[PDB]
Design a protein around this ligand. Structure first.
Ligand SMILES: [Cl-]
Lengths: 433, 438
C-alpha cells in the first residue's frame, strides 16, 4: 500500500537542492523587477473555478462549501485582485497546481503578472524581458520566444473563411505547427475536421510564415489583413512591442509566429511561448504567457475591467534539465550545507565534541558530529566525503590541552593546526563566510 | 442604492474557503523573515530537505477532521493533516533507516487561518547513541526561539516512560493510561483540583490513587528534580521510570554542554501526543503559547514498513502561525514601514518623448543585477514618479533629461533627502550599489 498518489512524486533531498538553485535564480529576477509576492490557499471555492474551464480535483462534499484544488495560479490571482478591490499589482507567485491530466498531476507553477491600466505594450515587453533574463541565467542552453497576438489570429481566420463554429478546433490544429509540418496540419484540418482545402491553404499562406519585426511590417501592408480592424490593432501592438524589445536588447530572441494559438480562453492580446533550441530547431517549451484583459472583470462585483499580462515559467522541465546538466559534469550536488564535521580519532571525547559543535552553532557555523561516542576517524571522513562536507575539525586529548584543533580539508586531505580561539574565523575564511 | 442581485451575488462568492486566507505582500514579508531564521537554523544543523504531495492515499492517512477528495473514479485521496505521517511513509517506501531532514509545508485540518496552515518540521531518524539527537532537537528549538526575538521562552520536558512507570507505581491500571494522561495534560490550563475531580468523578479513578498522582504531576523543575526522582523510593523500582529518568539525566548533561540547560523545565504534567511519543516529549512556551512541540517516536515508521522494521525517530514542529502574528505586531508597533519590494531605483524623466531612453536605461540596470523599475507611461509627470517611490520606499530616482543624455550623464535624486547630483552614466551602476549597500 506504500505509494504516492498517481501523478505525484516526493522531492528527494537532491531534487530539493536543484529546486532551490532554480527558484533562487527565478526569484532573484522577479525581485529585480520590483515584484511583490502573494500566496493563496491550495483550494478555492468550486464556484470560483466553475465557468472558466471548457480535470479539476474536487474535494468531497463533507457538509460545507464545495471546494476544488487550484488548476493554476492565474484564476486565484484574479480572485485575489477582485477581492481586495485592487486596480493594479505586480506580483509573482510560486506554488503547486493540480490537474487530473494524463509528476504531471501535481507540479510547480512559477508566475509573474502585471495588472493595471497602463500605456500600450510596455508591461508586455517587460514580461518578455523577464522570460529572457531567467532562461539565460538558468543556462539550459539556447532558446527562442515565439510571439503572436489574439486579434491577428481572429482576423486572419475571419478573412480566410473559417467559421466561428470551427474556429476553436482549427486553432488546435494550427497550434501543432511547432512540432509537426504544415503538410500534416493541413491534412488534419481537411481530412479529420472538415475544413475546406481552400480555407486551409489560405490559412497556410499566413500560418507558415515567421520572422522578426520585418514580418509585422509585411502584414501591415497585406491588403486583406489591413482591412480587418482587429488584426490591424494587433499588428500595431506587435510593432510597438518589437520597438521596446529592441531597446531591452532581446529582439534577436523573439520570433513572430502566426501559428502560436494557445490559451484562447484567456488571452485577448499578445501570446508568447518560450522554446528550447537545438544545434533553430524547437526542442520543447519552457515558458508561456500573454495578455488576458477579461479575467478580473469576471470576478469584480461591478464587472470593472482590470488589464493583466503575465508569464508562467515551466519549472518542472527545467528541474530535469538542470539536474542532468549537473550530473554530466561530475559535480556532486550537495543536499546539505554543513561546513565542518566535528570529529576525533581517540575515545572518551564525545563531551568535548558536543561542546565544540555547539560553540560552532553559536557562531552561526554549519556543523555536525556523528551520534556515536567513539567513531572511527575513517568512518567520519567517509561520511564527509559522501555528503561533500569540506572540513573536519579533529579533537584529540593533547590538542585540547594545547588549545588547538586539527583542521583537515576533506578533499585536499591537508591537515593544519588551528588555535581554538581562531577556529571560527578560520572556517569562515575557508568557506567564504 | 444597495446594489442589484447580480452585484451582491458576485460579492457573496468573492471569498477564500472558510478557515483559509491569502497572504498579502506585507504578510509575505513577515513570513519570509520568520522562515529565513528557521531555515538558517535547520541548515546550520546539516539537515536535508524533502517535499511530499499535498495529498496522500486515504488508506495511508488512517477522521471527522481530514479533508477527503471526491471519488472521481480513481484512487481515494486525502489532504495531509501533518508532515510526520508523510515522513514515515517516505522512510518506509524508500527503505531508509536514517535521514536528518526538515520539511516546511502546509497541512489541512477541518478544525474550529486555522484549517490550512504551515508546519515547520525537523526530524532525525536512525539508530544512534542515546539522547544525542534528542539533545540537538532541543538546541534547535532554543536557537530558533531566541533568534526570532519574540520575548522570553521556556521548554517543558517529560518522557512517556516516566509517565508509564509513574502511573503504575501509584495505582493506575494499564488500560486507563491514555485518559488519565488526557486529564493530567490539562494542568497547564487547569488547577489540580479540577483535574482530580475529573479523574475520580468523571474517569472512575480512586481518590487515594489520584492523590499520589498529584504528588508527582504537580512537580516541575530542573536537573535537580531528575536526581530527586531517581532517589524516589517507589519510582526508582519501576523499570520504565528508571529508564526514562536515566535518559533525562543524560539529556541534561548534553543540554549543559549546549548551554541551554537553563531554558529547560522538567515537567511531569506534560503528557501530549501519546499516540506518537515513546521517549522524550517537549513543548516550548512563550513567557509574558504553544509555539513548538516535539519528541521521540520510535514506533511510527515501523507501522508503515511491511516487515515491521523499526526506525527510531526524534523531531520537532515549530508553530509558525502564532509567530507570524507576534512578529508582525512587533514591526507595526515600531511604525517601521514594511517594504514589499526590493527596488533600489526608479528610472524617471520630467520631459516628454523619453520613454525609449528609460527603457534602454532600466534594461541596462537589470542586466547589471540592479533592482529597478519604471512607470508604464510614455510621458509620466516627475511628481507621479516621485510619489510612487515615496509610497513604495524606493530610495533613488534616476532622472533622464535630453541634456543629461548629451552629456553622458544621469541625474540621481535621493527620494528622502531630495538632493540631486549628476552621475556619469558609466558610474551609475556602482553609484547605486554604494548608496544602497551591496
Ligand atoms: Cl523632490
Amino acid at each position: 500500500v506504500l505509494k504516492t498518489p498517481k501523478g505525484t512524486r516526493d522531492y528527494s533531498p537532491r531534487q530539493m537542492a536543484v529546486r532551490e538553485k532554480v527558484f533562487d535564480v527565478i526569484i532573484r529576477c522577479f525581485k529585480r523587477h520590483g515584484a511583490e509576492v502573494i500566496d493563496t490557499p491550495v483550494f478555492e471555492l468550486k464556484e470560483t473555478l466553475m465557468g472558466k474551464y471548457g480535470l479539476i480535483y474536487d474535494l468531497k462534499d463533507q457538509g460545507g462549501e464545495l471546494l476544488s484544488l487550484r488548476y493554476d495560479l492565474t484564476v486565484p490571482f484574479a480572485r485575489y485582485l477582485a477581492m481586495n478591490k485592487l486596480t493594479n499589482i505586480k506580483r509573482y507567485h510560486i506554488a503547486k497546481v493540480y490537474r487530473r491530466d494524463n509528476r504531471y498531476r501535481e507540479f510547480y507553477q512559477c508566475d509573474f503578472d502585471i495588472a493595471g491600466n497602463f500605456d500600450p505594450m510596455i508591461p508586455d515587453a517587460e514580461c518578455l524581458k523577464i522570460m529572457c533574463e531567467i532562461l539565460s541565467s538558468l543556462q539550459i542552453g539556447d532558446f527562442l520566444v515565439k510571439v503572436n497576438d489574439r486579434r491577428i489570429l481572429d482576423g486572419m481566420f475571419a478573412i480566410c473563411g473559417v467559421s466561428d463554429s470551427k474556429f476553436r478546433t482549427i486553432c488546435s490544429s494550427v497550434d501543432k505547427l511547432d512540432k509537426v509540418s504544415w503538410e500534416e496540419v493541413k491534412n488534419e484540418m481537411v481530412g479529420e475536421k472538415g475544413l475546406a482545402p481552400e480555407v486551409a491553404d489560405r490559412i497556410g499562406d499566413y500560418v507558415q510564415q515567421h520572422g522578426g519585426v520585418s514580418l509585422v511590417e509585411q502584414l501591415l501592408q497585406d491588403p486583406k489583413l489591413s482591412q480587418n480592424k482587429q488584426a490591424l490593432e494587433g499588428l500595431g501592438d506587435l510593432k510597438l512591442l518589437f520597438e521596446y524589445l529592441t531597446l531591452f536588447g532581446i529582439d534577436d530572441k523573439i520570433s513572430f509566429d502566426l501559428s502560436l494559438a494557445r490559451g484562447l480562453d484567456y488571452y485577448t492580446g499578445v501570446i508568447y511561448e518560450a522554446v528550447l533550441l537545438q544545434t533553430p530547431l524547437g526542442v520543447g517549451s519552457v515558458a508561456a504567457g500573454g495578455r488576458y484583459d477579461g479575467l478580473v472583470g469576471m470576478f469584480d462585483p461591478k464587472g470593472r475591467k482590470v488589464p493583466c499580462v503575465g508569464l508562467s515559467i515551466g519549472v518542472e522541465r527545467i528541474f530535469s534539465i538542470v539536474e542532468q546538466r549537473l550530473e554530466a559534469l561530475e559535480e556532486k550536488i550537495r543536499t546539505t550545507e554543513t561546513q565542518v564535521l566535528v570529529a576525533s580519532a581517540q575515545k572518551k571525547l564525545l563531551e568535548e565534541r558536543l561542546k565544540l559543535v555547539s560553540e560552532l552553532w553559536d557562531a552561526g557555523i554549519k556543523a555536525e558530529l556523528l551520534y556515536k561516542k567513539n567513531p572511527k576517524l575513517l568512518n567520519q571522513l567517509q561520511y564527509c566525503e559522501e555528503a561533500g562536507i569540506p572540513l573536519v575539525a579533529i579533537i584529540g586529548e593533547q590538542e585540547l590541552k594545547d588549545g588547538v584543533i586539527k583542521l583537515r580539508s576533506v578533499t585536499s586531505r591537508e591537515e593544519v593546526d588551528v588555535r581554538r580561539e581562531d577556529l571560527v574565523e578560520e572556517i569562515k575564511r575557508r568557506t567564504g563566510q
